[PDB]
Amino acid sequence: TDFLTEAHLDLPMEFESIGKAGSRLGTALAMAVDHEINMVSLVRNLEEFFARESCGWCTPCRDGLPWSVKILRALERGEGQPGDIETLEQLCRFLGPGKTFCAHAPGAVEPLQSAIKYFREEFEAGIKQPFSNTHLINGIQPNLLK
C-alpha cells in the first residue's frame, strides 16, 4: 500500500475514505516509519521483497522490479545517476492495474510512487555521478550525444 504523511493521519480507516486519499485500506495493520529510518533503504527493502517474491510470469514486473531494485541499490550507496528517478516513474506508470498480468506489481510500486511523491528530496541525494553507460574504446571516436 501507499505511504502517507502526517496530513493524512487525521483520516478515518474505511475503504472509500482511503480511496480518494491516494492509498488503500489494505489489511488495516499500519506501520510507522520515524525520522531515523531513511526512506531510500526502506523502499529498497520493499522492492527487494517484491522482486524476490514475485512469480515472474509477465515481462514488466519480472524484468522491471530488478531494475528498480538496482536503481535503489545505487541510490543507497550514492551511485545514482541522472535518469534513475525518471526510470522509476516510467516503470511505475507502466506497472499499473491491468498493465501487468495481476495486481501484485501495482501493489509493489505503490510504495515507490508514494515515496517519490512525498519524499523526492531524499531520493535526489543519492545522485552523485553523471550518466556513464559506455566506456571509451581506443580507436573509435564516441558519438557525442546532445
Partner 1 sequence: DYTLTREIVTDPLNVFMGKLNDMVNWGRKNSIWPYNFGLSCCYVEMVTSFTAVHDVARFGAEVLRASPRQADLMVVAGTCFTKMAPVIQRLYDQMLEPKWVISMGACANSGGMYDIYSVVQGVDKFIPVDVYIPGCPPRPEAYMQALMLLQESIGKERRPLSWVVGDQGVYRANMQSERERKRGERIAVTNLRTPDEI
What residues line the site for ligand SF4 (CB under 6 A)? 54-58, 61-62, 100-102, 104-105
The nearest distance, CB 139 to partner 1, in angstroms, is 4
- Give strand pairing partners of 80: 127
* 21: partner contacted, choices ligand SF4, partner 1, none (Cβ within 5-8 A by kind): none
The nearest distance, CB 146 to partner 1, in angstroms, is 20
Q: Which of 138, 143, 144, 146 lies at the binding interface for partner 1 (CB under 8 A)?
A: 138
Instruction: Identify which range of 13-21, 59-67, 107-115, 133-141 contacts partner 1 by CB under 8 A.
Output: 133-141
Please, which residue, 98 or 142, has the CB nearer to partner 1?
142
* 28: partner contacted, choices partner 1, ligand SF4, none (Cβ within 5-8 A by kind): none
The nearest distance, CB 100 to ligand SF4, in angstroms, is 4
Residue 121 to residues 70, 124, 125, 126, 127, Cα–Cα distance (Å): 19, 5, 7, 10, 11
Nine-digit cell string for 29: 495493520
134 near partner 1, rule: CB under 8 A:
no
The full 3-state SS of 90-136, as one line of letters, equals HHHHCCCCCCCCCCHHHHHHHHHHHHHHHCHHHHHCCECCCCCCCCC
Amino acid at 27: T
* Under 8 Å between Cβ of 122 and 40: yes
- Give strand pairing partners of 127: 80
Interface residue list for partner 1 (CB under 8 A): 138-141
